[PDB]
Design a protein around this ligand. Sequence first.
Ligand SMILES: O=C(O)Cc1cc(CC(=O)O)cc(-c2ccc(C#CCO)s2)c1
Ligand SMILES: [Zn+2]
Ligand SMILES: [Zn+2]
Length: 591
Amino acid sequence: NMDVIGERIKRIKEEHNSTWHYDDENPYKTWAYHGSYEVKATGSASSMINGVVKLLTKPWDVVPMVTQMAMTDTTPFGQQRVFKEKVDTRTPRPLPGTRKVMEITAEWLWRTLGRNKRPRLCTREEFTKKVRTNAADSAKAAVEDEEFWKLVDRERELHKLGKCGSCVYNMSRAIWYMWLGVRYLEFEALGFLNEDHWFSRENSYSGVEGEGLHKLGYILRDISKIPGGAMYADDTAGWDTRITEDDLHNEEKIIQQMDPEHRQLANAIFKLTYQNKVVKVQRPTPTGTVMDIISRKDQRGSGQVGTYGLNTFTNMEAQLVRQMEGEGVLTKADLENPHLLEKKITQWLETKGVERLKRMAISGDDCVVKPIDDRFANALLALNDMGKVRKDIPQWQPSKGWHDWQQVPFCSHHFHELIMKDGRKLVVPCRPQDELIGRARISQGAGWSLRETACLGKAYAQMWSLMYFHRRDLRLASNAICSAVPVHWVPTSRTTWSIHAHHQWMTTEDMLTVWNRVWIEENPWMEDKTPVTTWENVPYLGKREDQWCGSLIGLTSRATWAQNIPTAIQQVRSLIGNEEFLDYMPSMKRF
Ligand SMILES: O=C(O)Cc1cc(CC(=O)O)cc(-c2ccc(C#CCO)s2)c1
Ligand SMILES: [Zn+2]
Ligand SMILES: [Zn+2]
């Protein structure tokens, strides 16, 4: 193994030979530990609070979930704890028949996915345009420096020679350039999966990439119309730690459809950075803080360019195999059998595969499957054997499915069908309200001025106006925040890193106009394009559903807060200073 990772370690060792040592009291059990070197402590024990959101959400000061979200440990102690819990484990190898089914399915799935699209190299200008339009950090400084691109070219030349010298994954500028350069080369070779939307619903059938949170509920309602059994949505315990050497070799098969110059570079990413990896992890010690250099041959690096697409691919593959077992195509004898008959697997894929892909919604490790019947609930032999063991359930206990698409969890949400005052139907995303308020109250980092804080608050408020307007507390809070923040201040910083976020709220455009564009105009499931001219005609969940999903409506603390909210808005306004504000409260029946 040292012939693939040796150069990378040698470079770290030489760069840090001042403090380099072999700490023989390292906690690594399943990862190969190479050595340590002293570093400054990174991360925080708690998170900075957004004072603007906090001052306008007083009844949530006494909410346990809200308080918990303000915590989250990112220090060396925090990193080490989570590492021990999941990351430091070994997945038993799948049986020979299981490996054969996975291989046949992976081959057919890659050909299906590549039927209209062809893989291609991503460029320096694509990465630059992304880094720019995202930041509008020190990544933009690297992208602007020609010296960064020269290091990129030098690493690429090693990659063409089947070698790696600096591509290290992380759990002054030279160390930073090497990380961003590793991510650029990964983007260059595998970015086409995201950039050319290989996992869009039109291309992949099961996929939802590029669809957006505002479309997922509509997709789940469409799946519910397909005849079959219940809708299943099983969670895998630590999916990324369950990616096997067999899964990686199956994912690699995409290189067969590439141009030779592209195949060479993607092969280097697969063989040197995915199937072999050098990882940096911070660890506290009595002496101080050290960086451990570790390695392994399996699992997925969660921060990588290809992670989402390759998890989506492998999960679509694992769900087709579970569907086959449910249908009696795959038996216990077949999974143990090295000489398993390929014919019936190939016949099922070619005649039923695509129809079976359409019964699913798959986003990385998140899946929803509507099998042809409920034998699937008890079809666990292949799922467990592939290493995709379901979270917090005995291994052989049958899965519990849902007979209502509205009860189905998917991508940290559930979805409600609403009836508007004009009789039109809307399908909206939803989650427990404490999680929404709890997140909005967290600002990211330190040294943030009241201006930047108010603008992040405005971004959260506007995200709620577009996605979660159907929650009474969030519409009130959203209007209060937008009334407290100067009208012309542009929402800055992101509210989420979610691939499902299209960030329509990142604007100073009127939110009712944006609402109309998203839910009416561009909405494929909205036949009648009549605009909604007032927020008074923008619907809410039924009062009972709003309460079931965490609303404080009907509580006295909530009525007190609503009644006294112009006072809290005025307090925020007075501290922000003499700027132009707009009273958004009259857009509600209360004012
Ligand atoms: O990032 C967090 O702390 C929560 C979170 C999680 C997830 C699920 C996931 O991607 O795993 C989605 C979101 C979004 C909020 C609004 C969105 C939109 C839209 C339409 O343009 S997507 C937020
Ligand atoms: Zn490299
Ligand atoms: Zn709900």
